[PDB]
Amino acid sequence: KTVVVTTILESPYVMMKKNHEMLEGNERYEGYCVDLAAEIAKHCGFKYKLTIVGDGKYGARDADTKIWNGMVGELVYGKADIAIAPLTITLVREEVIDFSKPFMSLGISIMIKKPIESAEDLSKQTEIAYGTLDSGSTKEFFRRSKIAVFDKMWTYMRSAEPSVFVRTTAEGVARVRKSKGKYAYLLESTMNEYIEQRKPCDTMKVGGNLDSKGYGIATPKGSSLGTPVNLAVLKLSEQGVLDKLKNKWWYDKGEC
Amino acid sequence: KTVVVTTILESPYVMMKKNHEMLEGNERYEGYCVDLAAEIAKHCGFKYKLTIVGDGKYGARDADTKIWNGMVGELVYGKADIAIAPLTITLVREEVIDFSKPFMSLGISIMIKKPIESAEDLSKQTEIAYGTLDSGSTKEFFRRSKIAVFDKMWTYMRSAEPSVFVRTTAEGVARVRKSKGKYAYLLESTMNEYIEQRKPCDTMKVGGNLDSKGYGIATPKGSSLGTPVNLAVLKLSEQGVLDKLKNKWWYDKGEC
Amino acid sequence: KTVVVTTILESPYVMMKKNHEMLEGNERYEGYCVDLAAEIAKHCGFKYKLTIVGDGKYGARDADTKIWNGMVGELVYGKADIAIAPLTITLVREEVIDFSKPFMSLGISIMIKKPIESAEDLSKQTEIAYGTLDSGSTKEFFRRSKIAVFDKMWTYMRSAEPSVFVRTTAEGVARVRKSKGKYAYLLESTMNEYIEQRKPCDTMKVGGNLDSKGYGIATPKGSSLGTPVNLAVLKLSEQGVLDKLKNKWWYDKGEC
Amino acid sequence: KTVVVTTILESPYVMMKKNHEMLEGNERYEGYCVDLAAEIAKHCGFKYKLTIVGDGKYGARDADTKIWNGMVGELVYGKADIAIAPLTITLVREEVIDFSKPFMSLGISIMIKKPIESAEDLSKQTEIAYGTLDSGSTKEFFRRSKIAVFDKMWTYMRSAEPSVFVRTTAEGVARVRKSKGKYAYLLESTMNEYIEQRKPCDTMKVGGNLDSKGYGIATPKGSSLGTPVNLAVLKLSEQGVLDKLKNKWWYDKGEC
Ligand SMILES: NS(=O)(=O)c1cc2c(cc1Cl)N[C@H]([C@H]1C[C@H]3C=C[C@@H]1C3)NS2(=O)=O
Ligand SMILES: NS(=O)(=O)c1cc2c(cc1Cl)N[C@H]([C@H]1C[C@H]3C=C[C@@H]1C3)NS2(=O)=O
Ligand SMILES: NS(=O)(=O)c1cc2c(cc1Cl)N[C@H]([C@H]1C[C@H]3C=C[C@@H]1C3)NS2(=O)=O
Numbered sequence A, B, C, D: 001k002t003v004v005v006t007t008i009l010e011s012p013y014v015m016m017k018k019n020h021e022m023l024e025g026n027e028r029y030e031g032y033c034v035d036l037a038a039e040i041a042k043h044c045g046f047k048y049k050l051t052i053v054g055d056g057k058y059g060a061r062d063a064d065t066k067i068w069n070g071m072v073g074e075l076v077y078g079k080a081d082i083a084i085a086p087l088t089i090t091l092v093r094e095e096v097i098d099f100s101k102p103f104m105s106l107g108i109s110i111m112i113k114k115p116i117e118s119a120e121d122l123s124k125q126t127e128i129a130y131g132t133l134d135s136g137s138t139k140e141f142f143r144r145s146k147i148a149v150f151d152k153m154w155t156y157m158r159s160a161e162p163s164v165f166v167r168t169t170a171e172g173v174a175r176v177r178k179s180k181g182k183y184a185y186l187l188e189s190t191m192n193e194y195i196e197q198r199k200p201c202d203t204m205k206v207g208g209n210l211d212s213k214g215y216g217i218a219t220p221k222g223s224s225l226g227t228p229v230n231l232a233v234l235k236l237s238e239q240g241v242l243d244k245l246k247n248k249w250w251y252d253k254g255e256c
């Protein structure tokens, strides 16, 4: 039986090809996650079909009806057999599905207009503003923080005029590019570097990751693909395959 | 029942108390892993007894007799119920034992005396020598690496005189401090930062991580502790506790 | 029973929530004294309701009818059970009501626009004018002062033109910000620091405190709350809670 | 009946006169506390006899025997009717004896040789050393402290070579004087100022008080001298008498 691989459209993980309208099957898509799916299938030996999640969400549960949307919902309700996507490994998600070892390491990073080379410097000064997404995991991390630096950041951002929070990541990047060095954006390190390697190459990632997270390949609880996929990720990590794929899709196809 | 925790003596993970002669039980030890064990036991609501691994080794499979030693041996042969230590998540270990999600991220870094800011700069120049251990993860990573930069680094190291390889990290740091800016050490980033934060403060860490690894909490295969321990690790990571413990034993206790 | 906690509307002690219309009860208020009331009630384990004093006055005795107004009136005439507010510990108030040990220390300081580093520096020179409230504790302190510096300051202020006395605190701060370094304001050190930590940040605090005063928690005479409240104040001061609460509402929420 | 006033020999509060062996009665002693006792007696209209505490201690429980020593024990066991001394208002003492409102404000301050202004700066730099007494309430303040600055200074102090903690305060000021700018002393603000005003006038108090404490007049619990002495202290504070006595014994009799 062929294995359904649910995933999401997000550059450079999964992207729609230039000549995709004429293509069919798995050839309509390309990216880091497509190559990762190919490597996992080669390691384990199964035939797979790539499918994009219908609602285009990573996955969350509502306190009202206790239902999961997105790829986590697709996994828990039997619609998909495996999720190969930039899905963050969280406790709430891990309670309902099985996560492999993280195949990519990320964290919260600072985006500026290409000095302030760390988070504490940005917190101290008020000359350069900084913002976060209007609603997201990074925003909740800032909200529920204990360290003094992040507490000061959150007290500043929550009570600030104009609203430094931004609806969507694209609007935040646009704000950073417009503000001619006045506004800094806080976001995931992987997306930060991806945008930094995009035209017109006017943004730069500065400093280190504020926290540490990871992306995992998720399977339903009690699935037969859990253990073999976990060993596949570890094998690809020690072989340097995962390092090669990140270099290819972030830098070899970069534009700077 | 009292769960036996197998552990190795490593700084700042598990060091002897300054007055361990006047103490008995788990009060004899302190460090990062002692606090981690305390929090893991608090989450799962059980009592434990810390035990230092007698062989003093992390764990590997014998080439001929196929017998594991170290904490991996203790878990495989039922001499312990958990291994709360900086145990690297690898493939063969994952095949014999169970690993949790990585509670700390590490990679190969460069140690220089307090001109070189990256591995590319290190490879291009020949003024400064550099090497790794005589045998271990770093040397095997450089031996099998197909990437051009690390391939060039390895072919330099193999054909360099005097020999750039050292017998143990202690003599590696010693040779770094004695060469007076004429030697770089390729070691784990955690040990790099720790030695950086020690007196007399004559070493620094340059560049990013060459690869990416992780330390995980090990548990015997088929144990009932694996899932609660994994959830405890995820909860501690999301609450910022692991952020605090790393900063405490690396920077707050630092002498620089 | 429910304990009535009379309070005054003063910043940053008790101020309205940014969206107090949507809220009700004790969640409708915020500030230093709200947190202090929460901790005091937690120590003594009682239920409380925050009520703003209707007259909007701290409390004084009428020289004609000998009737107290404000929160001192509420405590004397049995309209409240406790007064958790910046109430100054004075002689007549101590004669009518009971005060705890001072939970915060304050004095008379100098407010200048961001040449003078002490009160005697103000006294010796004449270029910069300075004054106090037209009616209040500071003017009376300067009036009946036998110390040479304070006596010289007072005899300058009395025989000065244009008049150096302001109607209220807001007018004094405004006159400080409308003189371009040609006017100094003599006010309480707590209000000095507060206005210093607010936008547009064009005022500073120079020199030490001219005298010593304290804010105390006031309880009705012959009540069972006095001794536990005094012990609670002492315990909170010894634990550093009072140090933290001032830092939060003065500096951690500052705008400079 | 004459009132017994227990005191402690401590400059400038209580001191022995140059011609004391010739004199008898209350004339054997002079200082800030002697003048304060005179003012309190005049306000309350009683005659008093000044006595020095036999063991020369302020007061502390001995946990094994549960017996108070010093002037606190003198008051508890009926030996003395009032204590007029630099007795800190603490939680443990307040439960057992009665304290008036504080007549003097003090705190922990930094003593240098006349570089660094504030305590956070001292914490950051490791060039200048600093340490408190081998015992006393300053170490207890530092240990219980949860703020990052004071906690990090405490962790520096605990693990420090050579031992920066000092046996006695005189040895501490001697070490500061001999250290020629290398060692800073942390102690009470009042004693800091007193030593600053004495020959050879080489030490200087710098920065601000780290915490806030106070000295109070102590009376046995449930005694008729409580409220009158409290009112006397308040009246003397509002009359400026306490300011005058502080100036007289710290500066008017200073030597710098
Ligand atoms: N450089 S990267 O973000 O593409 C990246 C990140 C990571 C990789 C591999 C790569 Cl290539 N493997 C590690 C894995 C190895 C073992 C230790 C942690 C997991 C299990 N996780 S990681 O630290 O999240
Ligand atoms: N010691 S550390 O600050 O570098 C550090 C490192 C890591 C942390 C948490 C911390 Cl505090 N959690 C992550 C975990 C979170 C979820 C995603 C990857 C694992 C599962 N692993 S990690 O990337 O190895
Ligand atoms: N830093 S502050 O003004 O908020 C402040 C001021 C003071 C505090 C505590 C704080 Cl946090 N406690 C002291 C108390 C402690 C004991 C000695 C005097 C009173 C009883 N009073 S204080 O010296 O008036």
Ligand SMILES: NS(=O)(=O)c1cc2c(cc1Cl)N[C@H]([C@H]1C[C@H]3C=C[C@@H]1C3)NS2(=O)=O
Residues within 6 Å of the ligand: C089, C090, C102, C105, C212, C213, C214, C215, D101, D102, D103, D104, D105, D106, D213, D214, D215, D234, D237, D242, D243, D244, D246
């Ligand atoms: N300048 S000083 O240390 O001699 C000093 C310190 C203080 C004085 C008076 C003087 Cl002179 N009175 C105040 C008192 C006044 C009222 C408010 C707090 C107590 C009751 N306490 S204090 O703030 O501890």
Ligand SMILES: NCc1cc2[nH]c(=O)c(=O)[nH]c2cc1[N+](=O)[O-]
Residues within 6 Å of the ligand: A010, A058, A059, A086, A087, A088, A089, A137, A169, A188, A190, A191
């Ligand atoms: N960077 C990819 C990406 C991955 C995500 N994974 C998640 O589990 C999630 O809850 N939100 C994410 C947002 C993004 N994003 O668009 O920044």
Ligand SMILES: NCc1cc2[nH]c(=O)c(=O)[nH]c2cc1[N+](=O)[O-]
Residues within 6 Å of the ligand: B010, B058, B059, B086, B087, B088, B089, B169, B188, B191
């Ligand atoms: N704690 C550092 C450290 C951790 C290790 N963990 C392992 O699982 C391992 O096989 N070898 C290690 C060597 C070292 N080392 O000596 O740098």
Ligand SMILES: NCc1cc2[nH]c(=O)c(=O)[nH]c2cc1[N+](=O)[O-]
Residues within 6 Å of the ligand: C010, C058, C059, C086, C087, C088, C089, C169, C188, C190, C191
């Ligand atoms: N700083 C708070 C503040 C506290 C006060 N307490 C009093 O007991 C009082 O009689 N007058 C006060 C004025 C002020 N003020 O300056 O607004």
Ligand SMILES: NCc1cc2[nH]c(=O)c(=O)[nH]c2cc1[N+](=O)[O-]
Residues within 6 Å of the ligand: D010, D058, D059, D086, D087, D088, D089, D169, D188, D191
């Ligand atoms: N008068 C100063 C002083 C006053 C003190 N009051 C106290 O209640 C105490 O327990 N210890 C003290 C030590 C000192 N000291 O540093 O000599």
